[PDB]
Amino acid sequence: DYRARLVYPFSGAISPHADIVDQATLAWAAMFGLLTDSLRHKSRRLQYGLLAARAYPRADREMLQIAADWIAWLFFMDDQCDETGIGRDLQRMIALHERFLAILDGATPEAHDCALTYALADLRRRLALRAPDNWLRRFSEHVRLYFTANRWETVNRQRGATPNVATYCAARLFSGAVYACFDLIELAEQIELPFYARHHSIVQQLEQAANNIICWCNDVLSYPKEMQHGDRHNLVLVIQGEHQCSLPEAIDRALDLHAREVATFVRKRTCVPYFDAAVNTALEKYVTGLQFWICANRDWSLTATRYA
Amino acid sequence: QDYRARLVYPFSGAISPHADIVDQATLAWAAMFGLLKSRRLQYGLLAARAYPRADREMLQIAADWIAWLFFMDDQCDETGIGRDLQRMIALHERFLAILDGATPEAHDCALTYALADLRRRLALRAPDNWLRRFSEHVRLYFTANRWETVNRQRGATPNVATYCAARLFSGAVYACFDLIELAEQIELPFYARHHSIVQQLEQAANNIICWCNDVLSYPKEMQHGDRHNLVLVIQGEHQCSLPEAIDRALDLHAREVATFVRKRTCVPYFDAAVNTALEKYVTGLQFWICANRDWSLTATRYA
Ligand SMILES: C/C=C(/C)CC/C=C(\C)CCCC(C)C
Ligand SMILES: C/C=C(/C)CC/C=C(\C)CCCC(C)C
Ligand SMILES: [Mg+2]
Ligand SMILES: [Mg+2]
Ligand SMILES: [Mg+2]
Ligand SMILES: [Mg+2]
Ligand SMILES: [Mg+2]
Numbered sequence: 001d002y003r004a005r006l007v008y009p010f011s012g013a014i015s016p017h018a019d020i021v022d023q024a025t026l027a028w029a030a031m032f033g034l035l036t037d038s039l040r041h042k043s044r045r046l047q048y049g050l051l052a053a054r055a056y057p058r059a060d061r062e063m064l065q066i067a068a069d070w071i072a073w074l075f076f077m078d079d080q081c082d083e084t085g086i087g088r089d090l091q092r093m094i095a096l097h098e099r100f101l102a103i104l105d106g107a108t109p110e111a112h113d114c115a116l117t118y119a120l121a122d123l124r125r126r127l128a129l130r131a132p133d134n135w136l137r138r139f140s141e142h143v144r145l146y147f148t149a150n151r152w153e154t155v156n157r158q159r160g161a162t163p164n165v166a167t168y169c170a171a172r173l174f175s176g177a178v179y180a181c182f183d184l185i186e187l188a189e190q191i192e193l194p195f196y197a198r199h200h201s202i203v204q205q206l207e208q209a210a211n212n213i214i215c216w217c218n219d220v221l222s223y224p225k226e227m228q229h230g231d232r233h234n235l236v237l238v239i240q241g242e243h244q245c246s247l248p249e250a251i252d253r254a255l256d257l258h259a260r261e262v263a264t265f266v267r268k269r270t271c272v273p274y275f276d277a278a279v280n281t282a283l284e285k286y287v288t289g290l291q292f293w294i295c296a297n298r299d300w301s302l303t304a305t306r307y308a
Numbered sequence: 309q310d311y312r313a314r315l316v317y318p319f320s321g322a323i324s325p326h327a328d329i330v331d332q333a334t335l336a337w338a339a340m341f342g343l344l345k346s347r348r349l350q351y352g353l354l355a356a357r358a359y360p361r362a363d364r365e366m367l368q369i370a371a372d373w374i375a376w377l378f379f380m381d382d383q384c385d386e387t388g389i390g391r392d393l394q395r396m397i398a399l400h401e402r403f404l405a406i407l408d409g410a411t412p413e414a415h416d417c418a419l420t421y422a423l424a425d426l427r428r429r430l431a432l433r434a435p436d437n438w439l440r441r442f443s444e445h446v447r448l449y450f451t452a453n454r455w456e457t458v459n460r461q462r463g464a465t466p467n468v469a470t471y472c473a474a475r476l477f478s479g480a481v482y483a484c485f486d487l488i489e490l491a492e493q494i495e496l497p498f499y500a501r502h503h504s505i506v507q508q509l510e511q512a513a514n515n516i517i518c519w520c521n522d523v524l525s526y527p528k529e530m531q532h533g534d535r536h537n538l539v540l541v542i543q544g545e546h547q548c549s550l551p552e553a554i555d556r557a558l559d560l561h562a563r564e565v566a567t568f569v570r571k572r573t574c575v576p577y578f579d580a581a582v583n584t585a586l587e588k589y590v591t592g593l594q595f596w597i598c599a600n601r602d603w604s605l606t607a608t609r610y611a
């Protein structure tokens with residue numbers, strides 16, 4: 001049971017609003033037309049709101065609902081990228097991303113824009129009511145880098161080229177949109193970090209470690225379904241190619257890198273400099289937020305139908 | 309004492325063969341926009357050292373941008389506006405509008421017209437992705453300048469940790485590093501541009517450039533009653549002598565140089581093309597480290 005080796009020296013939590021928020025995410029998906037014909041009875045068991053509830057457990061219900069709807073949006077987009085033809089067609093992906101990028105700049109969707117474009121416009125509108133311009137620009141750029149990473153994946157599929165470990169790990173930090181999900185922690189915890197603390201090297205390194213942990217945990221849990229689709233965006237498959245080793249050996253190596261990255265995150269937590277009382281209180285809420293996300297990803301993924 | 313002679317690097321810089329005509333054109337450009345002994349400024353000779361392999365057109369943009377930053381900085385650091393947050397906010401709102409692409413008007417100051425000209429010229433050489441990254445680094449520079457202003461108004465000195473974290477933005481070095489891509493005509497993919505070791509190399513280079521400046525600029529900053537200087541922040545935190553504070557600053561500078569050259573040897577192998585472009589970028593960071601020191605040691609600005 002290699003899944004038992006996905007362990008952390010810290011624990012998570014879930015919002016008491018979990019089920020209400022999950023029901024509302026399904027209703028939101030239906031409203032914006034994101035539910036496919038093949039998802040009729042499967043829709044019930046997606047449980048995207050139960051991931052959001054674990055990721056942002058202290059959030060007010062309104063803010064948690066934006067986070068839940070955003071997480072649903074990312075799953076709907078991701079299954080298009082990873083399980084349909086658009087993920088093998090760079091020109092179709094560029095055309096769609098041009099529409100998403102226009103909407104992120106504040107453009108209103110046109111009559112013939114697709115469901116995902118309208119849904120993204122709804123999330124931007126709702127975040128604009130809750131967040132200042134500074135935040136919206138930072139979130140938008142993390143989302144742009146996620147689209148860039150999806151186009152990078154598409155070229156890999158079109159070329160039949162598995163990236164090396166160094167390239168994969170560097171790109172994977174963007175292909176999961178985890179940095180955009182970290183941006184929501186500020187809104188959930190209602191914290192305003194000053195520029196010098198937000199961008200501090202140790203904070204960047206804690207964010208990088210948490211992102212790696214989440215993505216490599218996902219890779220160990222999602223390699224079966226990704227292999228079923230002939231995909232190559234997975235630390236297990238990337239390690240297997242680089243080392244020319246067995247699948248068990250690649251899984252063992254991936255779980256070693258995951259365990260090492262957890263110890264790096266725990267180590268670097270004690271390396272946050274003292275700025276002042278107020279900044280360090282806010283900063284500790286943000287880093288606690290990263291820990292809730294690490295736990296949310298594993299806790300939800302171990303029980304989710306998505307990886308069954 | 310010869311403490312300036314301890315600012316050494318285990319590498320050398322270079323200067324563009326176009327240095328003087330660019331310097332003369334920068335001085336002319338500054339006069340044309342009314343931002344302006346003038347011949348002693350030599351802002352073009354900093355740009356020529358920072359971007360030594362740049363085509364003349366691109367070097368001229370970089371030179372006019374460096375001149376702009378110096379003109380802005382002397383308003384912030386030697387003028388009343390740098391002690392007035394409401395007046396700073398008002399001016400920044402006009403800059404942030406021009407950066408988003410808004411046309412200047414009759415009410416806007418010389419710096420606003422000059423910034424609009426630079427954004428126009430950069431928009432002809434760089435894609436939207438670049439303009440956004442550059443604009444955000446400039447935005448963070450303005451934010452750092454307002455942080456400086458509140459420090460002056462409240463007469464507060466930040467601790468070493470706070471000063472060093474903020475100083476990475478108060479110098480606009482990251483905005484200057486963005487111009488390396490255009491100077492070298494390289495396109496780094498997202499995963500390499502934002503890689504942790506690249507970020508750590510940029511941070512080390514920025515710290516080196518800023519702390520070198522601090523050691524050379526503490527006298528003129530003391531004369532203006534300013535406290536945005538590693539030497540002065542160390543003096544306040546450790547309650548030590550000025551010589552001890554300078555020695556402490558130079559030890560941190562030397563350590564950061566050792567960190568930069570060590571982290572160069574930790575750049576991963578992505579692929580042949582990406583690593584070719586990356587070495588041009590990182591070499592660019594080294595040209596900037598040498599440019600800052602080489603120019604500053606002979607500049608009348610720090611005489
Ligand atoms: C982001 C992807 C991983 C694996 C980490 C957390 C999952 C999230 C935030 C929702 C899924 C968004 C898609 C990219 C699948
Ligand atoms: C940036 C500051 C240092 C000390 C190195 C490079 C100098 C430059 C790029 C212009 C000087 C004006 C700025 C302080 C606004
Ligand atoms: Mg994916
Ligand atoms: Mg997927
Ligand atoms: Mg996966
Ligand atoms: Mg100054
Ligand atoms: Mg200054």
Ligand SMILES: [Mg+2]
Nearest residue numbers: 521522525529
């Ligand atoms: Mg100075």
